[PDB]
Amino acid sequence: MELKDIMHILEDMKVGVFATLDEYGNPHARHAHITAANEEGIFFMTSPETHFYDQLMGDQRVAMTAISEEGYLIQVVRVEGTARPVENDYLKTVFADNPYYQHIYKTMQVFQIYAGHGFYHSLTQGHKYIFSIGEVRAL
Amino acid sequence: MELKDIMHILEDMKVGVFATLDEYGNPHARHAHITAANEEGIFFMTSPETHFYDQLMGDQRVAMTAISEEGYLIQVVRVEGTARPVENDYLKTVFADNPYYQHIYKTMQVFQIYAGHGFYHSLTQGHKYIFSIGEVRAL
Ligand SMILES: [Cl-]
Ligand SMILES: [Cl-]
Numbered sequence: 001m002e003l004k005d006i007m008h009i010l011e012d013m014k015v016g017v018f019a020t021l022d023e024y025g026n027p028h029a030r031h032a033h034i035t036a037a038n039e040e041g042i043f044f045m046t047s048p049e050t051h052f053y054d055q056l057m058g059d060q061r062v063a064m065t066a067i068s069e070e071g072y073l074i075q076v077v078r079v080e081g082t083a084r085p086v087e088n089d090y091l092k093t094v095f096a097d098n099p100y101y102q103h104i105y106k107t108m109q110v111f112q113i114y115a116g117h118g119f120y121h122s123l124t125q126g127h128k129y130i131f132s133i134g135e136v137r138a139l
Numbered sequence: 140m141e142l143k144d145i146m147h148i149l150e151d152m153k154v155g156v157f158a159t160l161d162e163y164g165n166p167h168a169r170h171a172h173i174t175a176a177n178e179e180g181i182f183f184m185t186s187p188e189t190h191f192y193d194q195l196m197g198d199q200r201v202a203m204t205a206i207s208e209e210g211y212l213i214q215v216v217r218v219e220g221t222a223r224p225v226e227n228d229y230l231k232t233v234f235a236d237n238p239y240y241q242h243i244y245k246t247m248q249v250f251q252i253y254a255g256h257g258f259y260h261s262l263t264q265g266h267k268y269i270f271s272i273g274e275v276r277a278l
Contacts, residue, residue, distance in 0.1 A: 017204050019158035019168040027166055029158040029202040030217060063168040065156050078169060 001129060003039050003136050006120045009068070010077045011037040016066035018044065020055040028055060034066065035104055040094050041133050042079065042113040043086075043104065056083055056111055064113065074123040081116015081133060085109055140268060142178050142275050145259045148207070149216045150176040155205035157183065159194040167194060173205065174243055179233050180272050181218065181252040182225075182243065195222055195250055203252065213262040220255015220272060224248055 060082040095101040115134035199221040234240040254273035
């Protein structure tokens with residue numbers, strides 16, 4: 001199993017809980033849509049003038065957990081890493097002309113978890129994988 | 140609407156994502172079972188020698204989000220506050236002889252979000268409430 005596949009699974013989860021820090025280091029956590037997820041990282045959006053946006057802009061550190069009980073599997077992904085805002089200039093090199101992903105080009109602001117380490121767990125099958133972003137190991 | 144009711148809803152969500160801090164202030168987030176939730180706070184368990192446990196013991200600051208798509212409602216609760224370990228001595232004053240909650244008395248360690256502020260949102264009905272723990276307002 002490889003990262004392309006883990007990230008495809010994550011992308012299909014559609015939604016994750018993202019934990020970020022304010023200027024006092026206090027934790028905050030909310031659901032956000034996973035716009036895309038692949039070998040390059042995890043992409044999501046938020047709006048300027050939201051606290052999620054402020055927090056990410058003030059401190060790149062992020063943790064995310066996502067879970068799917070879609071189909072007959074129960075799948076959990078946990079990631080800890082760093083997020084940055086990204087513009088179309090960068091997105092084009094990742095998504096290019098692919099029609100499934102044209103919506104990502106700009107209102108909203110896209111961010112990317114560009115570096116980190118993660119854990120993928122299929123609970124019903126007892127399969128655990130650890131991986132990095134920005135290198136997958138079956139435990 | 141009052142806190143007893145919000146917390147009953149939360150308790151029925153069964154599971155939340157809890158975000159905590161390590162000694163470097165880095166965020167971490169995982170699912171944990173909501174053992175109980177009421178006017179006194181939100182109770183959950185973890186084991187010694189887990190990172191969740193270490194983190195909570197090192198820094199009380201916690202954020203939690205929980206979501207239910209049980210029934211026809213879509214319900215989101217977000218809480219930011221502080222958690223502490225609690226022993227049976229304390230739990231008895233909260234749960235007493237109530238048979239539904241005897242399992243809470245001790246292996247595991249119970250914690251309590253004893254203070255904080257929260258947001259309850261029924262997305263399909265457009266109803267938003269803010270509240271505190273340790274005082275509910277319809278927005
Ligand atoms: Cl949320
Ligand atoms: Cl988890």
